[PDB]
Design a protein around this ligand. Structure first.
Ligand SMILES: O=P(O)(O)O[C@@H]1[C@H](O)[C@H](O)[C@@H](OP(=O)(O)O)[C@H](OP(=O)(O)O)[C@H]1O
Length: 1257
């Protein structure tokens, strides 16, 4: 008849005194029960996916059971016992696939495996059970042990061991050694009508009810119960179910990612109900149970439309497929109705929604094609092992808001809020952790499955394992996850009281502090002078107060900050003593050196605490260099010191330079300096990884060959460094290298910059180099990538002093050494008064030392030195020009005082553009903040007129400065954000700005329509410009029409035609007949210039991507209607600026008849031009005699054309034997001396013109 097999999926139905279908209580609770009333044979359980199992051969638990004795100090013996538990664990997978399908046979030793929870049924021999007192504890263990082997055997003696098992047979399962047979209890659990199954010799009879037979070739085939998402072929959109307006709606969901297929949520997942007849396992129909709610899908009231139905029974919840295979791309058909599905664009209150309704149509299409994207089974068990969590905190957060919870529930919830930690980090944290790194897909599975929501509706009403243990879960799921962080605001202020009962809420606000930088710092504020004083007066160890200290990041933190320091001098009530002033401290040290406990222990705390925050002082040095008195560092330790001298140094000497030099020399060198400069540039610049820099490290170890007070610490250094060279003679950077290579670390780099701030141009700084050579040479997988982040930085401090020296300090003398003669008498080396401008420019560095509190020396003395700059702006670029930029950098803080500009204004006085603006993009991300703040207030004035000047500068330069804008970081953000504020504002003539800082960026090699390929995407997303009745603000029009030209004006795609046609389209021309003289006259006293620029804007449509403008059939869709309308604008005068609208309309007028061949059917356009070119006054023809001679040759080539365009063009043959005969210009201007090339290119352009005419039309 019909047999059971290894592979079949069935159900087992208990037939003793309590009946049922076994089932779990979720992926949280590892128990097993019989829901007697949850279903019967005749009426199957409604969740008959959690009462399903797979029949497994016998598994191997000896080397894995050996591996569950982690009785060993040894580490090589542990990695051994594992490689045997994992080889075993894969020998199981191997052997289990061959045996796939066998007639099982009675008295085989099978185990049983849960599909939905993917854990093995297992008898825990050495336990009692929970609801029953004798029976062993039957649990669901994920990987199994010997306690999951089950002897299957026939209950009745109808069949008997040694025949092959039939389907249905009642059987008893009997573990191989764990003792007694499985048995469905009589004992309702506590919480749930759920009888707890356990092991105890009993007369229960297990029927075996098949579900799928062992033919489900997957993920190979779509068979009933596979979880899939349903992607859209045309629309490129997944199929989802949610609620809008408190109503369940299905829809297609829109994504803003830049990779459609990277939009995965746990709500587009649909269970497949391969409809059968009884509840079991491409020509038959299908139903989609929405994988999240439990509501199927069904199309009800395009004749019909899709929405969720609570029960998937109604014939409506049945469909039919059209091209089975896993990952098929199908078209589907709603059965009851006979219609084929279709996606609209009317959505369901929001501003810019996302939910696009989906409906049906009796018309079968070809593009509405969906993709049966199969879901990974783990992800399905992820959504599983979270929903549980949502409903666990749904009982417990419900039972503790209105009253009390037992001692069994605390133990299981606390447990829960440890497991989730064990989830969200992709199995890394938990306890005594080593690492703690997040896993993204789970975090999204929390805000979307209201784990988070549950959490905040739990805290709100001992707790020592509830809060802030939640609050560390919250510290894991918002990690580097913006969208989930835009939630802790109202929550952030639990961190306070949750910071009490435990400093765990501390963890969060610093996970805050850093990223939530800038904007975290404004809400604490003086709050802090009451949460360290508190955190000091309650957190006796004061952890809170400390990692607070460790949280300070960004210049703007120093303020509010320094305030608490003062509380500290009123708060030094630590009830202990420290003094000597060299002895009893020192003695202190000989004593905590003792690794003894309690006392010695303590020292670590105030030691770190001093190092970090006391050095904390960076360039607030003054506050730092005033708070850090006596300079001591004999015993230096962990880097504390290196930091402190930073604190003091800032007070003294912002070092700067300029780059040593300039001119052709630096080259002759570097070239002389050959690759070298390159080999090391890659390793540090790149080779963040060890290996790559390692190679340039071989390329090294072959080679072959008045400071006074700032000095008196420097020497103790060089000795110590040699030390690093004497410890260096010691290869091992083992344990030592934690201490040494930290203290070091804090040394290595701060020394890079200490040689860039304290060398000397005599044989000393260098000869010290010499000794450093022998220093730097004295020093040259596994847990060493967590350590090798730190190694990576060390090699930076290395190659860092190394390059600040070796690159830019290095080689400075051989230079001035080589002075001799060259031609003019032996002259060996042993802009006018360059001095005066470099000692007003030193009046400058002294400028660079001063500050705003200095009201006396602030305004009166310095003044606008800018005049010197403005006056020497024409003269050649000094070398201490990067030392100029010294001054520049400082003003990046702020500018309220009107004063800035006049001084700031000297800088504008510049005449070595290219080279600088290379150094000026230094601020590109800041100065992008200068256009985004300068832009939220423009369209104190020095930051928008200065971020614009900076812009026309990185705008009137190289084609490479153009590509360098490289403004994915951030164009689309300076056009979308400068617009955003800057569209709705527009400034009237004459002073008005939106047009020069969005009009010096698109200087695309000073015409024509090219190299602006970036201008289809940033011009892609934007808000448009006004239209129809009314009017708007002036200038930023003139600006706009032009600006559009250069964004969608490139010549290369077919867009450009629909682009200078999408929007204004043909329709624009109409409104350009009358009324913009009116918006320019309400626009500004000079009405007719914003109008006349409105006229170079409407006449230049042919000029930019004309060629392209035509693109596809652009001269066929407005043929006829633009030429006649043009006669409507055929007359004008007094046009110097509008005659740049008559050379931007003689370029505009040149782009009417350069491309046509069977489209022209109008008359008379030819006399009118001739008339307009004769009616001229003002400027020497030569530009209107190369635009009208340029007209006279572009006309004179055609020939038989015009000979259809009008009756004759005979006034046009005298007129080009004039704009071409001319005079010395036309009388006596005599301004051109490349005549022979004039007459030449004009007589090989009169020879190219001669070849043409023969082919006229
Ligand atoms: O840019 P960020 O800061 O990474 O933030 C993502 C961005 O807003 C995506 O557009 C969004 O996808 P949708 O547009 O499809 O929502 C995604 O949501 P998700 O994390 O929920 O996928 C966000 O995390």
């Amino acid at each position: 008849s019909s047999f059971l097999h290894i592979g079949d999926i069935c159900s087992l139905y208990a037939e003793g005194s309590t009946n049922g279908f076994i089932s779990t209580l979720g992926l949280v609770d590892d128990r097993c029960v019989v829901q007697p009333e949850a279903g019967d044979l005749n009426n199957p359980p409604k969740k008959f996916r959690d009462c399903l199992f797979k029949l497994c051969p016998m598994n191997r638990y000896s080397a894995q059971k050996q591996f569950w004795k982690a009785s060993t100090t040894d580490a090589v013996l542990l990695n051994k016992l594992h490689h045997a538990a994992d080889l075993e664990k894969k020998q199981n997978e191997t052997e289990n696939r061959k045996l796939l399908g066998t007639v099982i046979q009675y008295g085989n030793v099978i185990q049983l495996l849960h599909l939905k929870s993917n854990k093995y049924l297992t008898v825990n021999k050495r336990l009692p059970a929970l609801l029953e007192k004798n029976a062993m504890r039957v649990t669901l263990d994920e990987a199994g042990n010997e306690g999951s082997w089950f002897y299957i055997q026939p209950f009745y003696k109808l069949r008997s061991i040694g025949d092959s098992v039939v389907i249905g047979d009642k059987v008893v399962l009997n573990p191989v050694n764990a003792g007694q047979p499985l048995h469905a209890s009589s004992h309702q659990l506590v919480d749930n009508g759920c009888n707890e199954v356990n092991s105890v010799n009993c007369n229960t009879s297990w029927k075996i009810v098949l579900f799928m037979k062992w033919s489900d070739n997957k993920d190979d085939i779509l068979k009933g119960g596979d979880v899939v998402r349903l992607f859209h072929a045309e629309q490129e959109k997944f199929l989802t179910c949610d609620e809008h307006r408190k109503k369940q709606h299905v829809f297609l969901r829109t994504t803003g990612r830049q990779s459609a297929t990277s939009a995965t949520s746990s709500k587009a997942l649909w269970e497949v109900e391969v409809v059968q007849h009884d509840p079991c396992r491409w020509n038959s129909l299908f139903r989609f149970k929405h994988l999240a709610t439990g509501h199927y899908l069904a199309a009800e009231v395009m004749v019909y439309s899709l929405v969720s139905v609570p029960e998937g029974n109604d014939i409506s919840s049945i469909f039919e497929l059209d091209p089975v295979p896993r990952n098929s791309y199908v078209r589907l058909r709603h059965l009851c109705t006979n219609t084929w599905v279709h996606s609209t664009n009317i959505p369901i209150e929001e501003e810019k929604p996302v939910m696009l309704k989906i409906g049906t149509s009796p018309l079968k299409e070809d593009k509405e094609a969906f993709a049966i994207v199969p879901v990974s089974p783990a992800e399905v068990r992820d959504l599983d092992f979270a929903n549980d969590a949502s409903k666990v905190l749904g009982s417990i957060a419900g039972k503790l808001e209105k009253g009390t919870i037992t001692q069994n529930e605390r133990r299981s919830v606390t447990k829960l809020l440890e497991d989730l930690v064990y989830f969200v980090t992709g199995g890394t944290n938990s306890l005594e952790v080593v690492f703690s790194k997040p896993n993204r897909e789970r975090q999204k599975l929390m805000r979307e499955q209201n784990i988070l929501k549950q959490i905040f509706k739990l805290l709100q009403a001992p707790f020592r394992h509830i809060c802030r243990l939640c609050y560390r879960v919250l510290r894991h799921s918002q990690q580097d996850y913006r969208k989930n962080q835009e939630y802790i605001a109202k929550q952030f202020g639990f961190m306070q009281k949750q910071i009490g009962y435990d400093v765990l809420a501390e963890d969060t606000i610093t996970a805050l502090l850093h990223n939530n930088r800038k904007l975290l710092e404004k809400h604490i504020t003086a709050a802090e002078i009451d949460t360290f004083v508190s955190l000091v007066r309650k957190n006796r160890e004061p952890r809170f107060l400390d990692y607070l200290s460790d949280l300070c990041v960004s210049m703007n933190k120093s303020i509010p900050v320094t305030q608490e320091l003062i509380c500290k001098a009123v708060l030094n009530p630590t009830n202990a003593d420290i003094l000597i002033e060299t002895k009893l401290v020192l003695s202190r040290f000989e004593f905590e050196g003792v690794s003894t406990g309690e006392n010695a222990l303590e020292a670590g705390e105030d030691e770190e605490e001093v190092w970090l925050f006391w050095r904390d002082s960076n360039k607030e040095i003054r506050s730092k260099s005033v708070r850090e008195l006596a300079q001591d560092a004999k015993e230096g330790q962990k880097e504390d010191r290196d930091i402190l001298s930073y604190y003091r140094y800032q007070l003294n000497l912002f070092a700067r330079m300029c780059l040593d030099r300039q001119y052709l020399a630096i080259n002759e060198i570097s070239g002389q300096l050959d690759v070298d400069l390159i080999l090391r540039c890659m390793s540090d610049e790149n080779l963040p990884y060890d290996l790559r820099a390692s190679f340039c490290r071989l390329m090294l170890h072959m080679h072959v060959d008045s400071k006074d007070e700032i000095k008196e610490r420097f020497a103790q250094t060089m000795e110590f460094v040699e030390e690093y060279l004497r410890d260096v003679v010691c290869q091992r950077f083992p344990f030592s290298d934690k201490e040494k290579n930290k203290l070091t670390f804090e040394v290595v780099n701060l020394a890079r910059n200490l040689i860039y701030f304290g060398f000397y141009n005599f044989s000393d700084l260098l000869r010290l180099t010499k000794i450093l050579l022998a220093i730097l040479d004295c020093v040259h997988p596994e847990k060493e990538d967590i350590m090798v982040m730190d190694t990576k930085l060390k090699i930076i401090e290395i190659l860092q002093f190394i390059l600040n020296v070796r690159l830019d300090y290095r080689i400075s003398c051989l230079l001035c050494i080589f002075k001799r003669e060259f031609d003019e008498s032996n002259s060996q080396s042993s802009g006018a008064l360059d001095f005066e401008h470099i000692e007003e420019q030193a009046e400058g560095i002294f400028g660079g030392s001063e500050e705003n509190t200095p009201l006396d020396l602030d305004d009166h003395g310095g003044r606008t030195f800018l005049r010197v700059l403005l006056h020497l702006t024409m003269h050649d670029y000094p070398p201490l020009v990067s030392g100029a930029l010294q001054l520049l950098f400082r003003h990046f803080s702020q500018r309220q005082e009107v004063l800035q500009a006049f001084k700031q204004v000297q800088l504008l006085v510049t005449s070595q553009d290219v080279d600088n603006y290379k150094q000026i993009k230094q601020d590109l991300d800041q100065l992008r903040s200068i256009v985004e703040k300068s832009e939220l207030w423009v369209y104190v004035k020095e930051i928008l007129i200065r971020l614009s000047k900076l812009c026309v500068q990185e705008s009137a330069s190289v084609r490479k400065s153009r590509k360098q804008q490289q403004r994915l970081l951030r164009n689309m953000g300076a056009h979308a954000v400068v617009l955003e504020l800057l569209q709705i504002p527009y400034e009237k003539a004459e002073d008005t700005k939106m047009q020069e800082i969005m009009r010096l960026a698109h200087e695309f090699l000073q015409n024509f329509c090219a190299g602006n390929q970036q201008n289809q995407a940033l011009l892609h997303k934007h808000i448009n410009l006004f239209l129809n009745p009314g009017i708007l603000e002036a200038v930023t029009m003139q600006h706009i029409f032009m600006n559009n030209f250069q964004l969608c004006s490139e010549i290369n795609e077919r867009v450009v035609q629909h682009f200078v046609h999408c929007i204004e389209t043909h329709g624009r021309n109409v409104q350009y007949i009358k009324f913009l003289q009116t918006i320019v006259k309400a626009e500004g006293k000079f009405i007719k210039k914003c109008q006349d620029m409105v006229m170079a804007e409407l006449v230049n449509s042919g000029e930019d991507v004309l060629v392209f403008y035509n693109d596809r059939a652009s001269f066929q869709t407005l043929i006829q209607m633009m030429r006649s309308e043009r006669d409507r604008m055929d007359e004008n005068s007094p046009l110097m600026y509008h005659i740049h609208l008559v050379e931007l309309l003689a370029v505009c007028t040149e782009g009417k008849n350069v491309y046509t061949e069977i489209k022209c059917n109008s008359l008379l356009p030819l006399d009118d031009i001739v008339r307009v070119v004769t009616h001229e006054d003002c400027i020497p023809e030569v530009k209107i005699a190369y635009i009208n001679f340029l007209n006279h040759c572009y006309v004179d080539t055609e020939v038989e054309m015009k000979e259809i365009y009008t009756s004759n063009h005979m006034w046009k043959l005298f007129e080009n034997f004039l704009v071409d005969i001319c005079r010395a210009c036309n009388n006596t201007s005599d301004r051109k001396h490349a005549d022979s090339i004039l007459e030449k290119y004009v007589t090989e352009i009169v020879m190219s013109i001669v070849t043409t005419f023969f082919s006229s039309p």
